[PDB]
């Protein structure tokens, strides 16, 4: 950040050659004639007849020292540059810039102030001294381990991990209500426990502008949030990070509103949060538990309920969208995705994950970057003043029923089939992804990755088939209702649009090739069943969309995907046979004599190339 400001400030100096300024500004520039060493282009001694350059030249010096102090502290832990020679908070930086601004405007030069100087002020206000605020994320159970070791050391017959949720809250609230320190070096610590406490120590030693949210993975309960609040205070984080539960499993989402209501009802926490709360949802995470359709509908409803809780307690709720959702697609589709949020879930505060596989398309090219900022800003503003229609009672009822069917189908394959993990390990490069428990313990990113590579995409569509089939069978007029929902209900339309996009990236013929080369023949019937499910699910999706072909309503994306496919297919075929050559010691190939002027390297290249080719799915 300091380097970016420093490589820009001389342009402001060159441009602001004006001599007219206010009495206040002259005073400020006359002093600084004795409180150019380091520079990029602007080498000359600055005369007092150029007052803005005097002010801005001093900012340049502070920025140089800010940059170099950070470089030294980073590189060799130590710095000879005193903090008082640098900008340590953004207020110090903004003050001389805003002085320049008001002086120019007072002297008739507000058109000039509204040029580069205004751009610079907006950069400082957008990016601050860090460019980004850093989220800290850690699993709930890791905090429970810390509190268990602490209480076990108290030798009182039981420890934190034994206690009920209500018992944990009781102990946490007495600690939080009290003055007694929790710590002392009198604590036996595992590696993992020291890692948690040292993380908080590092936080406590750094400027608070460096950090954003403390995110709790696998959060379920109020004690999860209070545990972190206690540990922050007792590790001497003077400005504690806001604490953000990430509710992942479907059952955790169902319980999230009551958990948040309990937190808001606790006086200490209510006072702590000062009218604001962030809650994180993770689409890929919840789809791995229960299938994508049921995660999507439960996430819609969980946000409806969280808004009700937030309104009751007078808290301003920010939903943090984790990866895998329609808002994570980038491009145009993101625009309707934001507008499709349940009413009042945005309320002037949008927080969205920019997935790494999407960042290049979202920000790499300057026009696309502009249009990304624009659609996020426009859709956020519009949503608060123009919520989407609320679903008709019969739409909710049908979705409530389909979600049960879809989860049942998804879980019957993914968790109940005794040989699923076996098949998964063969049909898929998942194990090789790691080289360079079952599915429950597997992370969401490898889960999506593994089936993305084989062009099968099972995590994204599995369960839509049974659900649509059940709905159409139950009542012949549900097909027309599903199509009305696609036409009229933004949430349902963006949900289906994403599925259609992922099917357009899929090829069951390629997936069948991975089976042929890599899967035991006793499992070939299983893969064939999954591919028949793929095909039936695709056609029921197309029926719901009123489309004869995938992406019928988006010829631009269809063209783009078609032009990638031939390269991706080559990498697929290459990856499948390379996996066989790596795995099967009895696989014979006839090499041709070397053509051009390890197989593991080829495998890595195919995985990166295929991922770059397919970008975002679920």
């Amino acid at each position: 950040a300091a380097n970016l400001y420093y490589n820009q400030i001389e342009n402001l100096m060159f441009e602001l050659s004006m001599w007219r300024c206010t009495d206040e500004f002259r005073v400020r520039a006359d002093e600084l004639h004795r409180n150019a060493k380091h520079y990029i282009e602007f080498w000359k001694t600055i005369p007092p007849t150029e007052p803005y350059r005097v002010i801005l030249g001093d900012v340049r010096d502070k920025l140089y020292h800010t940059r170099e102090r950070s470089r030294q502290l980073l590189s060799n832990g130590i710095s000879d540059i005193p903090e008082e020679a640098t900008f340590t908070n953004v207020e110090q930086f903004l003050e001389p810039l805003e002085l320049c601004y008001r002086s120019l405007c007072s002297c008739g030069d507000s058109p000039i102030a509204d040029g580069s100087l205004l751009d610079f002020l907006r950069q400082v206000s957008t990016f601050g001294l860090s460019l980004v605020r850093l989220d800290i994320r850690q699993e709930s159970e890791r905090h429970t381990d810390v509190l268990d070791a602490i209480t076990k050391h108290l030798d009182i017959g039981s420890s934190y991990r034994d206690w009920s949720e209500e018992g944990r809250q009781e102990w946490l609230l007495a600690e939080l209500s009290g003055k007694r320190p929790l710590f002392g070096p009198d604590l036996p610590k595992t590696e993992e426990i020291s890692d948690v406490l040292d993380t908080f120590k590092v936080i406590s030693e750094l400027p608070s502008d460096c950090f954003g949210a403390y995110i709790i993975s696998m959060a379920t309960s109020p004690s999860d949030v209070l545990a972190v609040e206690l540990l922050q205070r007792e590790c001497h984080v003077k400005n504690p990070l806001r604490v953000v539960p990430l509710f992942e499993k479907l059952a955790d989402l169902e319980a999230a509103p009551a958990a948040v209501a309990r937190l808001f009802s606790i006086d200490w926490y209510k006072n702590r949060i000062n009218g604001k709360q962030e809650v994180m949802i993770g689409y890929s995470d919840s789809g791995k538990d229960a299938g994508r359709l049921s995660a999507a509908w439960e996430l819609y409803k969980a946000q409806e309920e969280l808004v009700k809780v937030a309104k009751k307690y007078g808290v301003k709720l920010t939903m943090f969208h984790g990866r895998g959702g329609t808002v994570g697609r980038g491009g145009g589709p993101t625009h309707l995705a934001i507008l499709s949020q349940p009413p009042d879930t945005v309320n002037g505060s949008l927080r969205v994950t920019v997935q790494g596989e999407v960042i290049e398309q979202s920000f790499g090219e300057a026009h696309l970057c502009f249009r990304t900022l624009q659609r996020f800003t426009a859709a956020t503003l519009e949503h608060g003043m123009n919520p989407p229609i609320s679903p008709k009672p019969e739409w909710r009822a049908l979705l409530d029923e389909m979600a049960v069917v879809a989860t049942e189908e998804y879980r019957s394959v993914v968790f109940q089939e005794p040989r699923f993990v076996e098949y998964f390990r063969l049909a898929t490069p998942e194990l090789e992804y790691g080289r360079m428990g079952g599915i429950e313990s597997l992370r969401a990113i490898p889960w999506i990755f593994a089936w993305t590579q084989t062009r099968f995409h099972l995590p994204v569509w599995l369960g839509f088939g049974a659900a649509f089939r059940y709905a159409i069978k139950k009542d012949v007029r549900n097909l027309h209702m599903l199509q009305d929902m696609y036409k009229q209900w933004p949430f349902f339309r963006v949900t289906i649009d994403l599925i259609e996009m992922v099917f357009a990236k899929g090829d069951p013929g390629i997936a069948a090739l991975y089976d042929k080369l890599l899967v035991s023949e006793d499992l070939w019937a299983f893969g064939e069943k999954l591919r028949a499910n793929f095909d039936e699910t695709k056609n029921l999706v197309l029926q719901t969309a009123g489309h004869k072909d995938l992406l019928e309503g988006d010829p631009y994306l269809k063209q783009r995907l078609r032009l990638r496919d031939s390269y991706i297919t080559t990498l697929n075929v290459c990856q499948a046979y390379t996996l066989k050559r790596i795995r099967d010691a009895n696989y014979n190939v006839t090499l041709r004599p070397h053509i051009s002027k390890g197989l593991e390297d080829t495998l890595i290249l195919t995985m990166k190339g295929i991922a770059a080719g397919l970008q975002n799915t679920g």
Binding site: G157, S158, D162, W163, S164, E165, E166, G167, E170, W171
Partner: protein, 289 residues
Amino acid sequence: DAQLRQLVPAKVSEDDKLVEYDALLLDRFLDILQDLHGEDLRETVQELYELSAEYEGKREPSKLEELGSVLTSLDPGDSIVISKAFSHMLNLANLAEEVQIAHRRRIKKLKKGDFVDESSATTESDIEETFKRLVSDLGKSPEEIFDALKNQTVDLVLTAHPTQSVRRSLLQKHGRIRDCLAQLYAKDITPDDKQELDESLQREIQAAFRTPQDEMRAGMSYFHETIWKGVPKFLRRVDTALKNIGIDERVPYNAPLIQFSSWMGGDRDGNPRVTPEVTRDVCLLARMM
């Protein structure tokens, strides 16, 4: 000795000693088996135990057939010794459970604060906790609680044991085993005390190992062992709970808060062995007792 520890790897409470109790009882019983019937018998019993404990680990049907090939090779006399042995081991395991349950310390922070607390002794409300919830959560007055308590009756109806009527002197042997188990793991136990408790435990294990009127007398055995003294001990606790919610009265001593009934020698449903004379006998026995 352990392997039990592999059957049950985790402790369920910090004061959980159940595996240790079982290992101790099993170790001493096997020595007694060896003293009485020889090392070969003991080694066979020990082999059967390992096979079935292996079965509990994975539940392979082939381990049951290994068990069978040993068991089916036993003549009638050896079959009796082996089935007696494993029956007695079960009895010892149940005594250890009783000691463990009796002395598992209450962790209040285990309570959830809802009705599910009442499905486990580790979380259920005792009588004063019941009083206090009725006052603070149901707005009942201590006078209302006291008045309802005075007029209430719990009537426990004893029925006969469908397979085994256990005689009073065996119950006493079982209580001494339990008492040894409890004392053996006390905090600052002396080495000679522990040595003597171990020798007492061994001799009581060995002593234990070696008509409708009869069923009734057997079934009336719990009054002298625990219920006779247990009833006024609990009624004294009710008094204590009453004072702690502001009722200074004791439960009136003639209030029938607790009554016991019996079917033993009275239930003739599909049992012609229960005759009018049997009924007269058990009435006289009960009055004599």
